Design a protein around this ligand. Structure first.
Ligand SMILES: *[C@@H]1O[C@H](CO)[C@@H](O[C@@H]2O[C@H](CO)[C@@H](O)[C@H](O)[C@H]2NC(C)=O)[C@H](O)[C@H]1NC(C)=O
Ligand SMILES: [Ca+2]
Ligand SMILES: [Ca+2]
Length: 274
């Protein structure tokens, strides 16, 4: 196991967003050409084991631990009836006080806020990726595709990501092999060697959230200078075509920085190898 390895993301230009937005409210449009300098990205979502090394080293108490609760999806026991703020739900206790991470050391860390994610990444000699870096990397060297691997959800009849199958939220069939999270090294890599960049856990980025984008070409953009929500990307094991069609690289959503949930995690990036 080497679940803190990073891969080199090459310098390049890419089309961020899409002129065929599927969730227009989220500012997926307009497509815009963005130049990204070479940098490093974590191959994997940060896992429970890796986060635990952080907490062991620093003594860090996460915001959900300090608040005393976090959001859990009802199906595994609000912004929807199926989101419940559960007392004692946190990264070590992902469905509440009588759940554990002991049997899932290699799954992505959950119930970490934007601040928690910044603390970890900076501890690791790293940082969060910008939205642009995140999306460029998600796209894995392909131009204007829906998904990291292309435009078919199940290429060659194979599942390529951990999302929802069945009738959301009543029934998750587990067709893809996982109802909740999967190990961070599950499913094929994209063309840059990244795992689970769509699906599994949502992923925090550094950017403040806006839905207002210029078509202007930009270089290593950092997003808007102010805001109230930070940008998350890539969707989760809860995502489905019918309600949360956000397991696309162009997709995007947001939460306040002190937010945490049973489907939200992160990975880090770095300018140089730490
Ligand atoms: C985080 O630190 C804990 C506490 O030391 C580690 O768990 C203990 O590790 C020692 C030394 O290997 C074992 O002998 C004990 O049996 C462990 N205690 C428990 C509670 O099981 C743990 O390994 C550390 N985690 C990481 C990811 O490094
Ligand atoms: Ca699944
Ligand atoms: Ca993910």
């Amino acid at each position: 196991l080497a679940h803190s390895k990073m891969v080199p993301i090459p310098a390049g230009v890419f089309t961020m967003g899409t002129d065929d937005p599927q969730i227009k409210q989220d500012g997926e449009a307009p497509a815009r050409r963005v130049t990204i300098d070479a940098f490093y990205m974590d191959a994997y979502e940060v896992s429970n084991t890796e986060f635990e090394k952080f907490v062991n080293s620093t003594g860090y108490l996460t915001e959900a631990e300090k608040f005393g609760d976090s959001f859990v999806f009802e199906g595994m026991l609000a912004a929807a009836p199926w989101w419940l703020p559960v007392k004692g739900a946190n990264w070590r206790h992902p469905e509440g006080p009588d759940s554990t991470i002991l049997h899932r050391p290699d799954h992505p860390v959950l119930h970490v806020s934007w601040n928690d994610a910044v603390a970890y990444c900076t501890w690791a000699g790293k940082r969060l990726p910008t939205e642009a870096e995140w999306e460029y990397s998600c796209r894995g060297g392909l131009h204007n595709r829906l998904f990291p691997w292309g435009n078919k959800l199940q290429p060659k009849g194979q599942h390529y990501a951990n999302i929802w199958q069945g009738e959301f939220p009543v029934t998750n069939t587990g067709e893809d092999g996982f109802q909740g999270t999967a190990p961070v090294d599950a499913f094929p890599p994209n063309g840059y060697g990244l795992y689970n960049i769509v699906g599994n856990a949502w992923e925090w980025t550094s950017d403040w959230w806006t839905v207002h984008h210029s078509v202007e070409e930009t270089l290593n953009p950092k997003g808007p200078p102010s805001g109230k929500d930070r940008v998350k990307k890539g969707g989760s094991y809860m995502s489905h075509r019918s309600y949360c069609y956000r397991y696309r690289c162009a997709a995007r959503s947001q939460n306040t920085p002190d937010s945490s949930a049973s489907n939200l995690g992160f990975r880090c990036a770095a300018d140089r190898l730490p």
